[PDB]
Amino acid sequence: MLKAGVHFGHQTRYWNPKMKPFIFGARNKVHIINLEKTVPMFNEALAELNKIASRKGKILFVGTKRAASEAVKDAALSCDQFFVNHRWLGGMLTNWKTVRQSIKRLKDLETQSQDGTFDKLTKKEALMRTRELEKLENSLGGIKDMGGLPDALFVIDADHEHIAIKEANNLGIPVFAIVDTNSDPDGVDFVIPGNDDAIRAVTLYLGAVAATVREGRS
Amino acid sequence: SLSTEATAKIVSEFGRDANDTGSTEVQVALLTAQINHLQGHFAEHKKDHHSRRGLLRMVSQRRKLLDYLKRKDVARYTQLIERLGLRR
Amino acid sequence: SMQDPIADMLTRIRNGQAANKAAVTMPSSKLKVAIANVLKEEGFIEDFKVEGDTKPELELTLKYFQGKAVVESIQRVSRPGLRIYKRKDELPKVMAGLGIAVVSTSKGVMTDRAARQAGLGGEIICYVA
RNA sequence: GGCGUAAAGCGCACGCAGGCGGUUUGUUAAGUCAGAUGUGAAAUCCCCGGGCUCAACCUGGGAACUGCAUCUGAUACUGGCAAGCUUGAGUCUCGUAGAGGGGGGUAGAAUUCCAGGUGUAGCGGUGAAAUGCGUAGAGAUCUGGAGGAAUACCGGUGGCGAAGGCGGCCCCCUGGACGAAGACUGACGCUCAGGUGCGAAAGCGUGGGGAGCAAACAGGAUUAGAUACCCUGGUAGUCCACGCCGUAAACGAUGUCGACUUGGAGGUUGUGCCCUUGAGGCGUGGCUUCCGGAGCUAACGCGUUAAGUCGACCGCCUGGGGA
Q: Looking at residue C89, which CATH number applies to its domain?
A: 3.30.1490.10
Q: Residue C103 CB: number of other CB atoms within 10 A?
A: 27
What is the Cα C61 distance to its own chain's centre?
13
Nucleotides of D under 7 A from a protein CB: 13-16, 19-24, 32-35, 66, 73-78, 87-94, 100-103, 161-163, 173-176, 183-190, 197-199, 257-265, 281-284, 293-294, 308-313
Bridge-based pairing of strands A175-178 and A152-155 is parallel
Q: How far is the CA of A4 from the C1' of D138 (A)?
A: 94
Task: List the domain range (segments joined by +) for residue C124.
Answer: 74-128
Residues C41 and C93 occupy one common structural domain: no
Residues C22 and C65 occupy one common structural domain: yes
Q: How far is the CA of B30 from the C1' of D55 (A)?
A: 91
Which is nearest to B31 in space by CA: B88, B74, B85, B70?
B85
Task: List the domain range (segments joined by +) for residue B82.
Answer: 1-88
Taken in order A132, A166, A38, A179, is the CA torsion positive or negative? positive
Resolution to 1 decimal place, in Å: 12.0
Taken in order C10, C11, C13, C18, is the CA torsion positive or negative? positive
CATH of the domain at C34: 3.30.1370.30
Residue with minimal CA–C1' distance to D87 is: C54
Last residue of a domain, one of C23, C48, C69: C69
Residues C49 and C29 occupy one common structural domain: yes
Residue C20 · residue A21 · CB < 8 Å: yes
SS3 per residue for chain A: CCCCCCCCCCCCCCCCHHHCCCEEEEECCEEEECHHHCHHHHCCCCHHHHHHHCCCCCEEEECCCHHHHHHHHHHCCCCCCEEECCCCCCCCCCCHHHHHHHHHHHHHHHHHCCCHHHCCCCCCCHHHHHCHHHHHHHHHCCCCCCCCCCCEEEECCCCCCHHHHHHHHHHCCCEEEECCCCCCCCCCCEEECCCHHHCCCCHHHHHHHHHHCCCCCC
Last residue of a domain, one of C69, C92, C120: C69
Q: How far is the CA of C81 from the C1' of D7 (A)?
A: 30
Residues C19 and C57 occupy one common structural domain: yes
Query: Structurally, how many domains does chain B consist of?
Result: 1
Last residue of a domain, one of C48, C69, C90: C69
Query: Structurally, how many domains does chain C consist of?
Result: 2
User: Is there contact between C117 and strand D, defined as CB under 7 Å from any strand atom?
Assistant: no
DSSP summary character for residue C82: B
Burial classification of residue A13, based on how many CB atoms lie within 10 Å of its CB (0-12 exposed, 13-18 middle, 19 or more buried): exposed
Residues C22 and C47 occupy one common structural domain: yes
DSSP summary character for residue B35: H
Distance CA B41, CA B51 (A): 9
Residues C120 and C91 occupy one common structural domain: yes
Residues C63 and C81 occupy one common structural domain: no
Residues C91 and C116 occupy one common structural domain: yes
- Provide the CB-side half-sphere exposure for C75 (13 A, CA): 13
